[PDB]
Amino acid sequence: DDKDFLWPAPNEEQVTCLKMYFGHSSFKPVQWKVIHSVLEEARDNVAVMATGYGKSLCFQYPPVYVGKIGLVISPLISLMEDQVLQLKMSNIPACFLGSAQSANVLTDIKLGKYRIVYVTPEYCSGNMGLLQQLEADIGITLIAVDEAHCISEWGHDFRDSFRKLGSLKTALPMVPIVALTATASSSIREDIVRCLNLRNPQITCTGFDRPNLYLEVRRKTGNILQDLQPFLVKTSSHWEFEGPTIIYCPSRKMTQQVTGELAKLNLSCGTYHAGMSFSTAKDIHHRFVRDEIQCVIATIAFGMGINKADIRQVIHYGAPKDMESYYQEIGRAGRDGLQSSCHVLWAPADINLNRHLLTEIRNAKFRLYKLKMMAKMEKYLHSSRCRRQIILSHFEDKQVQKASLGIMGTEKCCDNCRSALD
Ligand SMILES: CCc1c(N2CCN(C(=O)c3ncccc3O)CC2)c(=O)n2nc(C3=CCOCC3)nc2n1CC(=O)Nc1ccc(C(F)(F)F)cc1C
Numbered sequence: 001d002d003k004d005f006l007w008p009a010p011n012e013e014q015v016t017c018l019k020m021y022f023g024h025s026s027f028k029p030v031q032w033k034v035i036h037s038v039l040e041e042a043r044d045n046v047a048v049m050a051t052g053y054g055k056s057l058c059f060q061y062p063p064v065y066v067g068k069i070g071l072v073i074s075p076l077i078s079l080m081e082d083q084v085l086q087l088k089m090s091n092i093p094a095c096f097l098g099s100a101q102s103a104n105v106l107t108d109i110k111l112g113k114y115r116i117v118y119v120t121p122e123y124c125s126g127n128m129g130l131l132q133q134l135e136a137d138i139g140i141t142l143i144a145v146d147e148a149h150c151i152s153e154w155g156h157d158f159r160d161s162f163r164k165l166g167s168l169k170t171a172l173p174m175v176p177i178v179a180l181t182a183t184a185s186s187s188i189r190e191d192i193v194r195c196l197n198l199r200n201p202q203i204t205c206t207g208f209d210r211p212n213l214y215l216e217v218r219r220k221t222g223n224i225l226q227d228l229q230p231f232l233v234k235t236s237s238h239w240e241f242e243g244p245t246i247i248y249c250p251s252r253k254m255t256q257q258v259t260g261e262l263a264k265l266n267l268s269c270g271t272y273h274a275g276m277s278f279s280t281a282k283d284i285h286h287r288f289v290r291d292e293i294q295c296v297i298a299t300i301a302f303g304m305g306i307n308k309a310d311i312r313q314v315i316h317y318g319a320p321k322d323m324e325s326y327y328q329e330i331g332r333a334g335r336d337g338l339q340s341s342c343h344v345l346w347a348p349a350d351i352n353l354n355r356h357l358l359t360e361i362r363n364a365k366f367r368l369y370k371l372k373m374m375a376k377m378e379k380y381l382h383s384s385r386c387r388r389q390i391i392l393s394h395f396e397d398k399q400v401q402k403a404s405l406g407i408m409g410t411e412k413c414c415d416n417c418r419s420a421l422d
């Protein structure tokens with residue numbers, strides 16, 4: 001059930017609004033992540049989606065729920081007109097605001113009668129005072145910037161009309177921005193984050209099947225060097241991995257132990273955990289991105305905001321505690337689209353320890369959410385079925401699942417597919 005992934009749970013008023021104005025009885029997990037971050041945290045977002053299926057709900061739902069205004073900035077005039085028309089058909093007041101609009105329509109926007117207002121980036125930069133007035137008198141729930149990759153000079157479609165959207169955060173500092181694009185390029189994404197002046201944005205990336213990620217689950221011995229030796233290559237008088245690697249561990253103590261063994265081999269590596277000083281954490285991050293260290297041995301604390309496309313290997317040294325956390329972690333591998341591998345090395349004792357630590361969570365609702373995330377991970381680790389099929393069924397839509405049927409069953413899919421093949 002994908003309702004298990006919704007943290008925190010949507011309330012009855014939110015569900016009633018979804019059914020009444022959008023015709024859905026439930027939120028998809030990625031939509032809920034964006035909607036909740038906007039409503040409760042006013043958080044900036046970068047939502048990358050391979051297709052337009054379920055994209056508009058992320059930015060249309062929040063202003064409708066709070067009865068305020070959502071501004072949508074896009075250069076796709078005909079699509080914006082179609083979306084305005086579909087909103088009106090659902091009894092949601094919406095309009096395309098341009099230089100040709102009537103004074104009667106602009107007066108109703110100023111009075112807070114329209115929930116969604118679509119504008120071009122050119123109209124937006126020429127009428128900032130209007131947006132400041134709307135924020136002061138009504139309140140803008142969010143600003144959605146569609147085709148956000150157009151603000152990047154290294155993208156395939158740079159538009160100067162988008163560069164000016166860099167002033168949105170200075171004109172409207174409390175308004176969260178939801179940048180939308182179909183490109184999953186991590187380098188283009190860094191430029192979107194910077195040029196729009198987004199602060200700690202939540203990043204989501206959905207609709208991609210990623211056949212370049214090989215998945216394997218293997219039993220551990222707990223003898224660290226014995227477990228990691230198959231991944232190592234003797235190079236001169238020291239040892240190395242095939243490429244940039246992240247080893248995710250369940251604890252700070254395990255990161256020190258694993259790094260200690262790899263340091264004995266003079267492997268280029270560093271430790272990362274939330275117990276380190278700010279300067280030491282910055283240096284490991286800096287050295288990994290500059291390729292001055294090949295391998296980072298880390299807790300869950302490492303990973304977000306790393307613009308690194310050539311992570312060739314992710315190793316989870318110990319059973320992951322949470323299926324959702326595992327998904328974010330392996331998603332950091334092979335963002336350049338080249339072959340990468342994601343291996344879990346685990347033992348039943350790791351799961352028993354993980355379960356004991358779960359009893360330490362004081363918030364009962366959160367503890368149950370975490371318990372459900374752990375149960376999904378345990379089932380995945382013990383499974384003899386396709387690993388890719390399990391993961392996509394938990395996190396992706398039916399189209400992406402359907403698209404993965406081409407690699408499923410083949411020698412490049414996962415360890416279970418290779419074992420079933422021969
Ligand atoms: C897991 C989501 C995801 C990515 N995040 C972004 C957020 N984040 C942050 O660290 C992060 N969060 C918050 C703030 C800042 C941050 O930086 C973690 C990594 C990502 O960076 N990318 N990049 C892509 C590409 C797709 C195709 O072009 C190349 C790049 N896809 C994602 N995804 C989706 C994805 O990987 N799905 C997926 C699909 C199939 C499999 C399977 F079955 F094959 F194994 C496995 C998986 C996981």
Ligand SMILES: [Zn+2]
Pocket residue numbers: 385386387388389407408409410413414415416417
């Ligand atoms: Zn498989």
